[PDB]
Amino acid sequence: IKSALLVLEDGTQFHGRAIGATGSAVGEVVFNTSMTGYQEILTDPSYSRQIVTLTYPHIGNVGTNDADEESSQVHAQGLVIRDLPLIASNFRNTEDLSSYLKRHNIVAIADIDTRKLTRLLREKGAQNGCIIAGDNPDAALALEKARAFPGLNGMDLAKEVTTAEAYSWTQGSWTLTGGLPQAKKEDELPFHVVAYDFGAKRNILRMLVDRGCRLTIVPAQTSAEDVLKMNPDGIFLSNGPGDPAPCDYAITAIQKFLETDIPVFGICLGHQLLALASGAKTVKMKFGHHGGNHPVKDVEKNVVMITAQNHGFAVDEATLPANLRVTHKSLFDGTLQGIHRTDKPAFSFQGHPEASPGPHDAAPLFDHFIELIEQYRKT
Amino acid sequence: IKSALLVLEDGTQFHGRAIGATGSAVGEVVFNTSMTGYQEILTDPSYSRQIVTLTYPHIGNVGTNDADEESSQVHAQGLVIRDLPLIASNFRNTEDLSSYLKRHNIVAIADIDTRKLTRLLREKGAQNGCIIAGDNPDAALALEKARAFPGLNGMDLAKEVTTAEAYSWTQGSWTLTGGLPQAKKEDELPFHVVAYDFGAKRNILRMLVDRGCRLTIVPAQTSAEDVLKMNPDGIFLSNGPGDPAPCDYAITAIQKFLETDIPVFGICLGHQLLALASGAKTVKMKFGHHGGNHPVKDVEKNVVMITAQNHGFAVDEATLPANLRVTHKSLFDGTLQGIHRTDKPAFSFQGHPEASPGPHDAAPLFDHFIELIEQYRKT
Amino acid sequence: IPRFNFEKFAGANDRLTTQMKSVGEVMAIGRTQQESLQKALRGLEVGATGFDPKVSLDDPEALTKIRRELKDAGADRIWYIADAFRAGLSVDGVFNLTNIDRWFLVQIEELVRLEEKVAEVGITGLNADFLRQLKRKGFADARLAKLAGVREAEIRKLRDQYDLHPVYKRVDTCAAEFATDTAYMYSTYEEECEANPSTDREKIMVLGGGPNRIGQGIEFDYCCVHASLALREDGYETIMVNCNPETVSTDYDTSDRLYFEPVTLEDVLEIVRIEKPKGVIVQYGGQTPLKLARALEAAGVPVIGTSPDAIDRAEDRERFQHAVERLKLKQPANATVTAIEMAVEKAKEIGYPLVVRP
Amino acid sequence: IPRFNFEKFAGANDRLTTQMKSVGEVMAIGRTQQESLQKALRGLEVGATGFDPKVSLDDPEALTKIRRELKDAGADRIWYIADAFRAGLSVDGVFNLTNIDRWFLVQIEELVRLEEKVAEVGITGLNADFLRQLKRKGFADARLAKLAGVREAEIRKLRDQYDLHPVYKRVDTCAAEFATDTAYMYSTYEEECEANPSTDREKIMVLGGGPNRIGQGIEFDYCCVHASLALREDGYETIMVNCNPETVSTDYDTSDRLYFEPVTLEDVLEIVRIEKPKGVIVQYGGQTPLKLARALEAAGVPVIGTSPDAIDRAEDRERFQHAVERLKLKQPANATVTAIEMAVEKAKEIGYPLVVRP
Numbered sequence A, B: 001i002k003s004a005l006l007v008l009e010d011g012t013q014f015h016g017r018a019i020g021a022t023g024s025a026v027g028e029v030v031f032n033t034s035m036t037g038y039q040e041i042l043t044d045p046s047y048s049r050q051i052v053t054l055t056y057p058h059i060g061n062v063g064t065n066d067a068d069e070e071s072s073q074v075h076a077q078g079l080v081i082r083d084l085p086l087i088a089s090n091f092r093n094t095e096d097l098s099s100y101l102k103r104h105n106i107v108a109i110a111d112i113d114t115r116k117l118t119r120l121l122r123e124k125g126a127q128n129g130c131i132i133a134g135d136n137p138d139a140a141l142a143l144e145k146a147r148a149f150p151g152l153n154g155m156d157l158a159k160e161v162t163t164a165e166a167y168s169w170t171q172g173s174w175t176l177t178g179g180l181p182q183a184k185k186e187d188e189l190p191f192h193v194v195a196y197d198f199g200a201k202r203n204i205l206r207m208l209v210d211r212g213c214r215l216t217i218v219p220a221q222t223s224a225e226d227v228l229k230m231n232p233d234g235i236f237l238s239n240g241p242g243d244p245a246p247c248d249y250a251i252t253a254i255q256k257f258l259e260t261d262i263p264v265f266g267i268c269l270g271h272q273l274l275a276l277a278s279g280a281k282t283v284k285m286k287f288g289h290h291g292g293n294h295p296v297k298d299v300e301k302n303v304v305m306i307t308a309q310n311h312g313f314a315v316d317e318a319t320l321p322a323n324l325r326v327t328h329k330s331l332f333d334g335t336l337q338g339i340h341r342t343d344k345p346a347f348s349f350q351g352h353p354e355a356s357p358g359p360h361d362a363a364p365l366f367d368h369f370i371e372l373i374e375q376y377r378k379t
Numbered sequence C, D: 001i002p003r004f005n006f007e008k009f010a011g012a013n014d015r016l017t018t019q020m021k022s023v024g025e026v027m028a029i030g031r032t033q034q035e036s037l038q039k040a041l042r043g044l045e046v047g048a049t050g051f052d053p054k055v056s057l058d059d060p061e062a063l064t065k066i067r068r069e070l071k072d073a074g075a076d077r078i079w080y081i082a083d084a085f086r087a088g089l090s091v092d093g094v095f096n097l098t099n100i101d102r103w104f105l106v107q108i109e110e111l112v113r114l115e116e117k118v119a120e121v122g123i124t125g126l127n128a129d130f131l132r133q134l135k136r137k138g139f140a141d142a143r144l145a146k147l148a149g150v151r152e153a154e155i156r157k158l159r160d161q162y163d164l165h166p167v168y169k170r171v172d173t174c175a176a177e178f179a180t181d182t183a184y185m186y187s188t189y190e191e192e193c194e195a196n197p198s199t200d201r202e203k204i205m206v207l208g209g210g211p212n213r214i215g216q217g218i219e220f221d222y223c224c225v226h227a228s229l230a231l232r233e234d235g236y237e238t239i240m241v242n243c244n245p246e247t248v249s250t251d252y253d254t255s256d257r258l259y260f261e262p263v264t265l266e267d268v269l270e271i272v273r274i275e276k277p278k279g280v281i282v283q284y285g286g287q288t289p290l291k292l293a294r295a296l297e298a299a300g301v302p303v304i305g306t307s308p309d310a311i312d313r314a315e316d317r318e319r320f321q322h323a324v325e326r327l328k329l330k331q332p333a334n335a336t337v338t339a340i341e342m343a344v345e346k347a348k349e350i351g352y353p354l355v356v357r358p
């Protein structure tokens, strides 16, 4: 019998079974309502420093596969689920979830009341916690580690997950039939985008490559000057973990880009940095948004899209600068989801257009970028 | 598919399958003919720095259990077998072999021609080798590491496996019915033996305790002086790894014990040490003796006994001091197996009277020791 | 789970195909697939308590019947699947015959193994840890009593003793992302209870008729709705117990409190235990609630309306005949029998042709 | 594995018990159990290539027959055990019926799975890696052939292409701790070969009779032993091929070389391939080597003594019948037949009573 336990800051304990690596995990506990897409979620860098709870009770029905990885590794600090299924049952599976978790040295626990956890978080707001998987897990110890956690508010995480060295990306999106395509020859891509890695998701780039954009990924702290020197066709701001505010370097740089006429597009963290760089404020959400059924309105066109969301921080509408116009708003709670510079060719989205996992409703947002790039090229 | 590879100093390669931990292992390669008792063999300290090859193709048929551990850990450097059974099938089983090996972090290979390996070693004598288990094992690197192996020749291994602080043992032998007994109360033990820990098997101790001794285990380097000071009813010299030669400290001390009338007993290494201490010579054998079917003759009674052997070194018969009289020889190669002091109350055995695993044939060798002891007590 | 009525259609082909033949359906909610499924089996009203065996283990011909039933699905296939596991068939073998995803199959096999342990360990071995674990998998006290060779009531008492009761969760459309003011609940064995029953009102519980079948349809639901409507209007807190998805009675709108649960003694007593209703109505959901009447009453349930006993006087053909006799009314020439020999004897007298009425 | 003759004793009880019923036995050596077992199966001479199927996959009553055969052992049990795995029974399911240790069972289940793969991928899927893996688990070219729906000679060819031939190990009492100058060998698929064949002399190969059985017993061993004794004395290097343990012929003193192997085409061809003998005798080991003659010669084997065509003239009843005629000799009134109807017709002619001789 393999004990595991999850202790939140408030002192609440969840006793269950270890399904991953042995040891301890500490971070911010969040809940995700996605019924499918657990692997993609796990490998999402935005989760760095977060203990992920899944609302759907059976997690792992489809095993895992590399194609469903959104980064090189699993970023989630820990995993919490209700039930780990006896078997994975899917033609695409290459490894059961449990083996996968152990292989990635992930501390995870199953067999707990994820709904109780969920309600608490929804009601009292985000908390930090600690999971201890092992023989006689010590509650007091987990408690102490959860209380000792510093907290994501004000924590710069983009710097922690960003790319050491800059690089190139020319690969497109997966297909049932084909699978993950082969990288594209530079000469094959009309456009050239510079993408700031604040802990970016492979699908974002794949989806960009898909639009005929050639990419150069750079470390988050890359200077605007350095960037300009490459003559980008447009710039791109990636998603990423923790507080966007403390990212002085990226904001500053951004401000720089905006003095130019290059088209800029940001997603999630990117969206926030871009707001920031335009003089807007950011606030940490009560529990944030994590799931894939999130209704977002295109206020301009008065249409809804079901979106992929994963954010704990949000842009304050009220503090919004006049040069920033609102393009989208959550239908669930009314928070800000999209913005556009009135004066410059720059816009961003809070949700995740590239999805993975989730609905494809937002993908078109990309297209608008591409339009901006084409027009800059005209000029 | 998980690879593994074993490379011998001579350049000979064995490609197979990984069955234990990931990594590399280097040591002197040896073959063991035991058909049963692989776990006991694994946890035998004398195997330290040795990569053990088993002749009996199917290894792991009975799984593993704690009672079948002869030490607190696995001493073998590596494990080389022909076939790892699909299942373990024995009521005593608690963990399949693979799991156990991994848990002990042992690099192990399977699916190789062990017979060809055996013949090689037997033909050309012991060789050092390297086992690399992992994604793409590098045959040239393996060779390199094998080649680079120092050699147990002149290697004092006793010091490396011995106990840190001396201790007391009062535990008896295992029973089918009762399993491993509870430790006894010192007062229940007539005799008091002092044991040098040269990397001793638990079975030696248990069998001793079994015969009424209360034990005190001491580090290999302990001073005779320190010893004598406890007033032991008898002293004992355990089994252990490496060259016995290099162990000057123990030699020195044993010399010091043989000045006194205390009964002394040496098993394997202890045998070699005592012979050393008596001014005899030790050699390193071509391939040594490793099995549980070894016929040994009690020259005195002209009686044969099947024994458990494990020794890479031996005592030169044609250099034996007159004070040294031969009690036993090997019927396979006529090697020296047992000696007794003409003058003193000190004798020894080259093989393992304690078996574990192996025939119980030579267990009376202990009785002699008890005779010697009750006699010194009469005195 | 679909509900069939093949027994009513003797010469009918009863293998399932692309042309529907079921008459109704049952629905269950559980925190896990196993829990959900077991609850549905017991809510089906076919007399199951979960995966009751269909063939004997010591039948030599058993492996042949099973294979038949698996390969060519009839309405009882689900039970034959668990029988296949009891008989030594593998998940792969069963898959090959059925084409049912192994994802599911493995779960059923697991339940079968648990059953086997209970059988072996008997009541004595049903320790709180184990019992809990079993309850968590959707095991009905009755199935567990069957396996341990005891009365269902004993299992129930045991649970009580161990303070082992289910918690109630609520349906909300959003996996708890948002709060709910509605009370559409379901049972499960977990930590937090979300039932939060009133103390404020006078409560009346209405027991629905489960899945629709021939002879027990929408009429029964219509009454249940009306009972719910009328009383609520009168100012009573109304509580509905039912598991037929096709119904208005299972529509949140219909009552103050809705428990989407199996209409079983177990399920109902657990509800009663926290609601502590003023009364429970058992005459508006068909045969099912009617058969439970006595047991409920025996168990302390404040059944209102015509008594279980009075019901018994009518439902029991000997009692009824009696009464008629008591009232000096006219009935035809009849008799009340329990064994063929007696019945055979009993029929010469009465006369042919005659009507066999259970 | 024991050798039985139940077919000769119709009304007998053919269930295995505490009283012996077998008539002979075969023995096999392999580096692994799987290897060992399969060789024995094919060395038994009961028509098996290894695990040939007893029942059809599409026989409704198949699980039932299997059940029986497992529950109550017959001489055929081993083959039924494989059929049980093909049919969907688990190791546990099999253990329960048989009481045979799972250590063995899993092994058989694994060969079955490998067999199903061969059946799926067919001759195209027979890459060297896989084929090699197959040879290592003891699979016979002949079994692979049926599964791959090709000819045995095709697998053997494929093996040739790949350079997939077995090595020979030696029996030595000590697990290679000491060298042996005796040539008592068995075939295996490994690295090192210990065959070390002479180039020195003219060799003569004698093929043994396999397990003893009614009709072919010790007489044939006695003859084999003598042939070796004779020729050896005459200066020839003598090689024995046999796998009956109870024989003097399988004694290491007996010949120069001893291959403790199944007497099959595949197995003999391999030794021949390496021995390159002067001649082979197929006339002193019963019906076996007699049936192999044609195939051996056709495969380049240097068969000595009475020819394979000659053996066929005598062994084929129609051919024998001609010979008698051509010689103007007397034989009864007879006819050679292949089908009933015709047989029936011919019988009328010959007249009853009559002897049926295959």
Ligand SMILES: [Cl-]
Pocket: B013, B014, B015, B111, B112, B113, D191
């Ligand atoms: Cl090899």
Ligand SMILES: [Cl-]
Pocket: D011, D012, D013
């Ligand atoms: Cl008989």
Ligand SMILES: [Cl-]
Pocket: D125, D127, D129, D130
């Ligand atoms: Cl393959």
Ligand SMILES: [K+]
Pocket: B015, B016, B111, B112, B113
């Ligand atoms: K190999």
